[PDB]
Ligand binder design. Structure first.
Ligand SMILES: *P(=O)(O)OCC(C)(C)[C@@H](O)C(=O)NCCC(=O)NCCNC(=O)[C@@H](N)CC(C)C
Length: 514
């Protein structure tokens, strides 16, 4: 979970009257002292509702260490250790067997480079990246009882690096290259394409990963390691890196041993499952939402991407609104989405899905892998509350849920036992997330670089709203919608309505949600 770290950050910022609080910054180095520690403790007790003391701040003076302290799980330890498929990976493999996802669970990473890179040096750099991170060369075979991992040696890991000439626009080409299917049993879950053309000034570097090997949080380590490996091979040298604290299989083995078995009543898995069974009781099968077409018998996973650019003034107003009411920016976006669905006639019981990153352990905080568990955040909007009252409801719902974020979502589905159907995702069909793209990626590969948005031809749910920060000040709302249900114009209107909800909430949080 990251919400604790963000809350401690804004409490640091407010108490210090300071606007450069990072996760690893020391409280006393930023200008804090003993008297100011009282305000940090008091504010963290009122916001997180956990017993915090002055001693906790002195022993854990950074927002990352303090957040971890405030939340018995063994640390990740290293282990030719055999690969261990995490429950995320098994569930991601499973969704490709249940549905034809059309590449919806491929994650893209597109970087425009002012110079056309050297394909041979790039291929060598990718081989080094694949050799460093075992999860990028871990195959998944379908056996009798399900998935079985196969780790390829670096010499046997045949990388997929190629140059593609773009006659067409270039943004449409990225969509289609992203959705190209992976054969998880034979091909490594990483494809690399270099797009050049007469309309492409320089080149566009596209990293297509299957989610089984990487989440959106892996963008920073992927780019950093690929940059250092490219600049080393360009200089005729193997990259010289500090060894990895752990591979993904180390994290997976540690997590599953600590999770325990669902039959053990005292295991963390069972105790968290019992919470979700009660928290998700009498859940709506599906929210009644106005769609352009009725739900088809099978979710085709066809989709589009509607974007809403946010003005910098609104982004800061959202930041100010979050710090004002003691909630994270995600909680404001999640409350705004709930208001939007409520005003569309969905009712007072709004279950929204949301990803929660399991990157608290410092050995996996900056590593490549999939750490996003899916949680059902069930917010109630009865009693015609104000947006401020809703922000308090959302925080109470989120913090209670974030304390049980380790139960695998597939196990949660199995315990809640909703009416199953391949026409819809279970327990929720609208997901909301807050994402931050990597910062300081403007001067990579010895050139000028910038992340490029990839329009998607796929969708995982009915609706997926993401508050995406680009890493260099800007922010925008992305709505990944199912084309089976919504036309592109309807999605564009939906995301513009979400921005209006936020603008109205920042202006006056005392207005009723109705
Ligand atoms: P943070 O680390 O920034 O601040 C710590 C703080 C507030 C400086 C405390 O450590 C603190 O208050 N230190 C001073 C404590 C102190 O000096 N107590 C003695 C006060 N004098 C007496 O009590 C009196 N009996 C002296 C006798 C005559 C020896």
């Amino acid at each position: 979970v990251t919400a604790y770290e963000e809350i401690v950050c804004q409490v640091f910022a407010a108490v210090l009257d300071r606007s450069d609080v990072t996760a690893d910054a020391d409280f006393f180095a930023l200008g804090g002292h003993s008297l100011l520690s009282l305000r940090v403790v008091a504010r963290l007790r009122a916001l997180l509702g956990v017993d915090v003391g002055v001693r906790d701040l002195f022993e854990a003076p950074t927002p990352a260490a303090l957040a971890a302290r405030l939340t018995r799980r063994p640390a990740v330890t290293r282990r030719d250790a055999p690969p261990v498929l995490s429950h995320f990976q098994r569930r991601l493999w499973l969704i490709e067997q249940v549905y034809q996802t059309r590449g919806a669970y491929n994650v893209p990473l597109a970087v425009h480079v002012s110079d056309r890179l050297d394909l041979d040096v790039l291929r060598a750099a990718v081989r080094d990246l694949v050799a460093r991170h075992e999860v990028l060369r871990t195959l998944v075979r379908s056996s009798d009882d399900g998935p079985d991992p196969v780790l390829l040696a670096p010499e046997d890991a045949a990388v997929d690096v190629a140059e593609v000439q773009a006659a067409g626009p270039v943004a449409d080409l990225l969509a289609e290259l992203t959705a190209q299917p992976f054969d998880l049993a034979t091909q490594i879950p990483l494809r690399v394409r270099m797009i050049t053309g007469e309309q492409v000034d320089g080149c566009v570097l596209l990293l297509v990963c299957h989610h089984i090997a990487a989440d959106e949080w892996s963008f920073a380590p992927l780019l950093r390691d690929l940059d250092t490996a490219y600049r080393a091979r360009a200089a005729g040298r193997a990259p010289d890196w500090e060894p990895l604290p752990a591979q993904y299989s180390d994290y997976a083995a540690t997590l599953h041993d600590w999770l325990g078995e669902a039959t053990d009543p005292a295991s963390p898995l069972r105790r968290q499952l019992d919470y979700w069974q009660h928290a998700l009781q009498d859940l709506p099968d599906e929210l009644d939402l106005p769609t352009d077409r009725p739900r088809p018998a099978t979710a085709s996973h066809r989709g589009g991407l509607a974007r809403a650019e946010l003005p910098p003034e609104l982004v800061e107003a959202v930041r100010r609104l979050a710090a004002q009411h003691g909630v994270t920016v995600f909680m404001v976006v999640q409350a705004a989405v709930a208001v939007l669905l409520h005003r569309l006639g969905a009712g007072d019981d709004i279950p929204l899905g949301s990803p929660v990153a399991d990157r608290a352990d410092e050995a996996v905080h900056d590593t490549v892998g999939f750490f996003l568990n899916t949680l059902v955040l069930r917010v109630n909007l009865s009693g015609n509350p104000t947006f401020a009252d809703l922000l308090d409801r959302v925080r109470a719902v989120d913090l209670e849920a974030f304390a049980r974020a380790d139960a695998p979502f597939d196990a949660v589905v199995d315990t809640v036992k909703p009416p199953r159907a391949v026409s819809r995702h279970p327990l929720f069909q609208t997901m909301v997330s807050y994402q931050r793209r990597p910062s300081d990626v403007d001067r990579l590969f010895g050139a000028a670089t910038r992340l490029v948005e990839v329009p998607l031809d796929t969708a995982k749910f009915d609706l997926e709203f993401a508050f995406i920060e680009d890493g260099h000040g800007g922010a925008h709302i992305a709505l990944n919608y199912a084309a089976d249900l919504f036309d592109h114009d309807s999605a564009e209107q939906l995301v513009a309505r979400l921005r209006t909800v936020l603008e109205h909430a920042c202006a006056d949080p005392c207005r009723p949600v109705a």
